[PDB]
């Protein structure tokens, strides 16, 4: 054809709503960040957080780690031809400070203010010392001031005709079931780009996905695929995948459940430990994930990928509570006083109340749904009554934000050090705010823990940072805050029918996934090249 179209699948939808607002992660399309709004810097997390400079050409932190200046690349244009400058960066950060519902990461608690030094330099002032703040700053979308300052309420703005900095800003085709996002005519890095457009089909769940990917209809995906060698790999020599290791997955319990009986159970550490011992984590990996994961028996959730960081003494002390031990679970329930007093085989609370835990995972995330159903069965074998629900992701998510759920199975962000998981999963500041994600919504709060998290990057002292990690590990482990299950994978499938250049095990340039929130996907698409099709008629 006359243009190359790359078929991608970042996110499940039942119908596409035209929304390219990069601040509205709960309602926008998942090709907005990176592809329409390019970041200042992409940190290559798989390669030691190596900064890859994009719209900024440099940054420099102060010696006291209380401020940082970014240098903006000259000669970059917005897709409408106007210049990308410091003005746009300063506006974007002031916008998020003024409208904190647009803060999806917690940036506002780190950056007290921004200043334009000149047309191509921005200075950020910090609330506390933080050597990790350039990483945090890179998370914030930069939008064109000359457009957005004329918008009446950016927090409700759907941005249907976007002006962007990234490689793909033109909305070529848009229907409820398909849209096509084509090349920015003024793209600053055009000589590096060999893909003409992104083609985005509507896919609601893993079952619908399976049929399409096995039939060779996709190019770049990151979905769960069951029995992948037999179903997908075997269908074509052009069907490939690479699954580098990812983050923790866990059952999260609501410490503020409004039901008296359920609250009584979930806030009890003996109960959380018994729940944890009932689980057969390797069987969950084997059945629900077809072997694609590693047991996580760290009460702190750290997982085995951070051996240099782990306090082995703490891990070993609480490991027994995070290992399969059904008899141990029954004994602990008995010692704690969860006794069955109405002859149905299921333990009741110390106050004598019956209860059944409702465990949720998102609709269509079938690997997680199957994990929950296995756990329900395993819990029954120690006398804990539970049953599964698979609500739509938005309903699942909202139940966690509002604290109406009982237990949720979830994955987490994964980074180059343990802070990505521990901060996002446990910092109580992330339990409030209309832009917050689900990850900290157990509503367990510990002042000492927050203090340690907020000091993680405060000293430039490697040994002290390690001791802070050991402190965090001890607190979370001894309180068994969540029930960690496994460490998962960055699922990624690619097709060599129409494109080459893919990252893979022999070319492991970075995280290969197509999800929003993987900024490396920008770097990945800049490596892809179309293949000339085999002739036919
Ligand atoms: C940390 C986090 O929330 N990551 C999300 C991804 O898990 C999610 O991808 C979905 O993951 C499910 C669980 O393994 C899979 O069943 C499902 O196939 C997969 N969906 C897609 C479209 O890849 C993505 C997309 O919802 O969002 C990430 O934020
Ligand atoms: Ca290139
Ligand atoms: Ca009972
Ligand atoms: Cl401003
Ligand atoms: Cl631990
Ligand atoms: Mg203003
Ligand atoms: Mg301007
Ligand atoms: Mg080009
Ligand atoms: Mg010390």
Author numbering: -1 to 535
Question: What text appears in the publication on this structure?
Answer:
VhCBP is a periplasmic chitooligosaccharide-binding protein mainly responsible for translocation of the chitooligosaccharide (GlcNAc)2 across the double membranes of marine bacteria. The chitooligosaccharide-specific SBP is localized to the periplasmic compartment of the bacterial cell wall and serves as a mobile component of the (GlcNAc)2-specific ABC transporter. SBPs share a common structural feature comprising two domains connected by a flexible hinge region. VcCBP and VhCBP belong to cluster C/subcluster IV (C-IV), members of which are specific for oligosaccharides, including mannooligosaccharides, cellooligosaccharides, and chitooligosaccharides.
(GlcNAc)4 partially occupied the closed sugar-binding groove, with two reducing-end GlcNAc units extending beyond the sugar-binding groove and barely characterized by weak electron density. The electron density of (GlcNAc)4 on the reducing-end side was too weak to place the two GlcNAc moieties at the imaginary affinity sites 3 and 4. This suggests that the mobility of the fourth sugar has a knock-on effect to weaken the binding of the third sugar. Flipping of the Phe411 side chain was also observed in the complex with (GlcNAc)4, as in the complex with (GlcNAc)3, and appears to widen the space at sites 3 and 4. It is most likely that GlcNAc residues are present at sites 3 and 4 and are disordered because of the large space on these two sites. Docking simulation of the structure of VhCBP in complex with (GlcNAc)4 revealed that interactions are formed mostly with the two GlcNAc units at the affinity sites 1 and 2, whereas on sites 3 and 4, only two hydrogen bonds are formed, by the main-chain carbonyl of Ala514 and the Oδ side chain of Gln102, respectively. The middle glycosidic linkage of the bound (GlcNAc)4 was also twisted, as in (GlcNAc)3 bound to VhCBP. The disadvantage derived from the twist of the glycosidic linkage appears to predominate over the advantages derived from additional interactions/disorder of the GlcNAc residues at sites 3 and 4, resulting in the lower affinity for (GlcNAc)4. The binding affinity did not correspond to the degree of polymerization and was the lowest in the longest ligand, (GlcNAc)4.
